Design an enzyme around this catalytic site. Sequence first.
Site, short mmCIF file in Angstrom:
data_model
loop_
_atom_site.label_atom_id
_atom_site.label_comp_id
_atom_site.label_asym_id
_atom_site.label_seq_id
_atom_site.Cartn_x
_atom_site.Cartn_y
_atom_site.Cartn_z
N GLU A 122 0.85 -1.43 -0.11
CA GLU A 122 -0.10 -0.03 0.03
C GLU A 122 0.92 1.34 -0.08
O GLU A 122 1.20 1.51 0.91
CB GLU A 122 -1.01 -0.04 1.20
N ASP A 123 1.43 1.70 -1.04
CA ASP A 123 2.20 2.96 -1.50
C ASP A 123 3.50 2.61 -1.09
O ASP A 123 4.33 3.54 -1.52
CB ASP A 123 1.72 4.11 -0.86
N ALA A 124 3.92 1.69 -0.73
CA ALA A 124 5.45 1.44 -0.43
C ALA A 124 5.98 1.20 -2.02
O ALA A 124 5.38 0.61 -2.83
CB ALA A 124 5.64 0.35 0.45
#
Lengths: 49, 243, 335, 35, 45, 102, 48, 334, 67
Positions: free
Chosen positions: C18-20
């Site tokens: 999640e957005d890494a």
Amino acid sequence: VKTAETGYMSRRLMKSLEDLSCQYDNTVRTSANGIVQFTYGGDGLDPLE
Amino acid sequence: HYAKIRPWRTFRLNECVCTPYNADFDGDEMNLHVPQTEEARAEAINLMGVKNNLLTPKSGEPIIAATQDFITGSYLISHKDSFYDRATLTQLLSMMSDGIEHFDIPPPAIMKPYYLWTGKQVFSLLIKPNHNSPVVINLDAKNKVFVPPKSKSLPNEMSQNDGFVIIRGSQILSGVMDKSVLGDGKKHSVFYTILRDYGPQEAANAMNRMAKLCARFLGNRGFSIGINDVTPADDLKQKKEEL
Amino acid sequence: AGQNATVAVMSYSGYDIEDALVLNKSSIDRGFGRCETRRKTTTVLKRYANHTQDIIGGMRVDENGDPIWQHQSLGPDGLGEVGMKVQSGQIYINKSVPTQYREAPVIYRGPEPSHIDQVMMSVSDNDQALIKVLLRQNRRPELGDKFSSRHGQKGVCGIIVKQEDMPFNDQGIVPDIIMNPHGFPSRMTVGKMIELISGKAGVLNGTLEYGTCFGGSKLEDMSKILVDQGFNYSGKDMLYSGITGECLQAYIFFGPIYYQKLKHMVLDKMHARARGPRAVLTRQPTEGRSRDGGLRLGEMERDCVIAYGASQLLLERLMISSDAFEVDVCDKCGL
Amino acid sequence: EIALFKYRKARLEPGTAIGAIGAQSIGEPGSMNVT
Amino acid sequence: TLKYICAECSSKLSLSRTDAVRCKDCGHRILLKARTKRLVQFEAR
Amino acid sequence: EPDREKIKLLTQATSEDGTSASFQIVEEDHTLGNALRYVIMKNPDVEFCGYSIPHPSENLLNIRIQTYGETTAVDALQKGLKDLMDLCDVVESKFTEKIKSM
Amino acid sequence: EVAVPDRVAKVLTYPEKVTRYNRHKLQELIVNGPNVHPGANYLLKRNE
Amino acid sequence: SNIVGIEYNRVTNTTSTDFPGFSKDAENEWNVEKFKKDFEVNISSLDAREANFDLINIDTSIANAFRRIMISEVPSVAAEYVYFFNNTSVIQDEVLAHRIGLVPLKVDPDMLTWVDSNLPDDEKFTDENTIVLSLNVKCTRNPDAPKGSTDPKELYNNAHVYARDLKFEPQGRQSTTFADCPVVPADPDILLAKLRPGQEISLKAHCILGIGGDHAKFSPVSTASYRLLPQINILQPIKGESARRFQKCFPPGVIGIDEGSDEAYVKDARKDTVSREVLRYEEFADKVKLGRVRNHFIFNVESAGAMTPEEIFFKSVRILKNKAEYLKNCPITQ
Amino acid sequence: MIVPVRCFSCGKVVGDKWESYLNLLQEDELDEGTALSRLGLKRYCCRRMILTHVDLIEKFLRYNPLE
Ligand SMILES: [Zn+2]
Ligand SMILES: [Zn+2]
Ligand SMILES: [Zn+2]
Ligand SMILES: [Zn+2]
């Protein structure tokens, strides 16, 4: 505007509902042992279960 | 949680746990508190523990379950046309186990041309790996996109697009693995049934196997998004400016 | 402000959920995303009405002509030497207030060292000394720095990967960043899917392209340059797997995106406190981050641990380890 | 055996902060001219 | 030693206790301290 | 002079026949684990082989071997290490015999 | 589990009171001291 | 089937399928004297900086292993510690030290030993494990300048400092051992920095050897990669003007046409970058089936300068051999 | 501020091909994409090293002490 009213809503429902608990008598009582509910939900059951 | 001591400068929770915090990995921070007394250390791990708080008290529904990219890699295995041989299967079973957990290989789904295992036989080994494991689950569930069967007499699992999951004896006989059976809303989730029949650790162990497999599978299978996914075909482009 | 990263839009390692974003180790070793911090420190050697003046001290040697630890980076005139490394406790301006002199030097209290690059000795308008010392620090991408594209997709660095573990094409190019395909459908940044092709077709052609609003370069003749070489029209390449060697079973959308590195860095954000200074009125731990610290547990998480029923945690986390106070009450008065 | 064991599990345990739990279950989640 | 590079004249001038911050031959009042003569180690990483 | 800490036997994972075994090999990576897992899985008796690097901040690797009941899983490891050396002896041979013939 | 940075783990302690059962364990944390991670920052005697 | 199947949306048949217990006919055992009959190396081209060769009839577990040794684990010499004396240039010292450790060097790595870490900092750098390179430049204003005066090469004497300004000081016995092969930077016109009058750089750099998994500066190749060869199967032959546009769907040398409109035949299927531009046209789909041979690898190994790119490959097979050899002679701690 | 020595995604040395890139454009002029290929930058990761390189060392060196 959604972030404020989400926290503000359960923070004021808390201040009435902090010190209500299920007793060993199976009733739900207050701080001063006044009955709110003779049994929780009318069946005594737990919503998490 | 239980602390784990690692060499970087950042807090690393598991991704199945970032749904109750309602957080993502975009720069936000969290707050760690270390309790200091034996009574306050034992109330926190037993009442506030992760394995005991796998359900929200709001409705008794799973809230710690498979996140966005562990549903995709799980669907892409248990998709109907994934077939694995012994070299790929046992490597795929070692991804989820760290090369420690013992496995009993079932007979393959397909025998005469080659020896092939469907992707639904792989998730049935994620639930119970061998005969010593106690987890024997029997659930029955509809997926998100459920195309019904052709006639209304064929029951539910004769559906088109393979969208009704039936598990009998901790083994998956139909249906893909998706948000409906691995995510955080339904009381017919696979993780929910393991918790409600076998306890918080066995549901946590099966989730840690699925987190490790889908974090090693999907970078070796490949999944990606391009401009041809978003591009309309030229018979949509004519039919759009008619409607 | 940014660099062109080679970006493979694919799901990889499970550390980009999640957005890494997955990062290359050999890119960081060559200078991808490597930044530098500079900080000023002003002291004013004020003269007083008593006709006595603040003074800069001297090098304090011990046992022979070598300095002590706090004066290693100091030099003879009390102002630190340009080019020397200061680290977490040393002195780089040795000033003294008043003829007694009460030593009040400045002490570099940072979690990482930093080199003196500029020491400036001047005098302000009212004829008193003004020392500004600039301090330089080099820093590279750690786990936890924020990168972003120019499409509102902020992201953090989740893992740094060894470059023989990255996927590679037929020419041998490996990505600098791997970006998850799950940040596109909910966010609907289709103009990032056109930045990659226009970026890719432009660098193969030798020309910078345009993505200006209501115009720019066109996708149907960026895909003309891209077949001209022998790449796919859609920017999707057949990458091999760096870990297992095999062909990946999908074509990987692959090319240059312009990434920019943000100021929110995890070295300036990681802090932690066991015990420290307390506010003299409330005798609770202090405020802010640039103090020792103290993280507030306030009025909304108290609610959370009441709901767990954890009563001795709430006793410990609020009283025993925030402000405990042994007091003597009277039993007949109550005071 | 299964169904009865699920029914004793489902009862509200004494001591629980059932009002505090109910106050977070409500305030937390997100015809003509009506509010 | 000789230090304190001037700001724009780039002249060189040591300073006593209480002479000035004036660059003599320039009159400008910003003085940059010059680089040290010590060895500074860097790793090439 | 033996190296006591390169390779272990994770006794918490093995059987008592020795037909199953896990091995914690340190200072190795995908370059040596995947080459073994190809070679070991080319035995007629190996019924499971798969490595795994359990955390990337640990220079470490767990190989898992389960055989049928005719070979100890140490013996299938020690066989599959020998055949990997025999592979590179062929590859060193034909590479040099085509360089020096050029 | 949660992964804690080993620079935070050096500053966030736990008051481990010594017993029969962790007497040998806590002696190893004393001699490692505050600057290596299986270690310890303070010691508070029984009476001092 | 060893052919990877390339289609328009997905790639099929990518795994090894050569173990016993893939089928009822439990074939494809190990049989090292049968691998020796099957294995074959062809050498396409060989330069002083770039090798190109095939590795036919192996598994991609072994072929990727050779690629991962060459990138990450074959050792080489690079500058590691820089000791600055009087850097008054605009480039910062830790930036210039990163630019100097990143230049390649013509040291042969077999002439040096590995430095230690758990030894003191005084006897650390012996003349068998370090190499001292010094840079020492000074920018002066050239008085004899032409009066157009814009290009800084005739404005200043040493306005640019390049990598061939890194001289070599032989320490100890290195004045006899390295008397034949002095350390030159393998790409000597690397622009390290550039200067203006008054600014000055002087330094020494100590050059130890390490591997590429430590830092990327120790990686010996500029890219060691492989690819499989594409096979282009022209089912149901294509002629006429359709063969003229079937030619254009590939890179230009890949596919020829014999006598105008007899048929389209594939000429050099090694040459195509696989872009599957044929599969976006519904005319040629059912009349072509392009794939990729999973046994046949095509290595391209190009060096950074230090050693010849077939010695990078010979060392990398030797390293993967010595990993299996070391681990076989280690006792298993039960 | 000055050219990177190596390409980030390969490690191919591109720092010696900035002084020669500007000569192919200034004299004997080329269209910036056959001046890349003439220097031998095939891979697009290596072409973007010097095509999108903005050279700031030339402007920073205008502001030094004249010395
Ligand atoms: Zn009283
Ligand atoms: Zn002046
Ligand atoms: Zn570089
Ligand atoms: Zn490159």
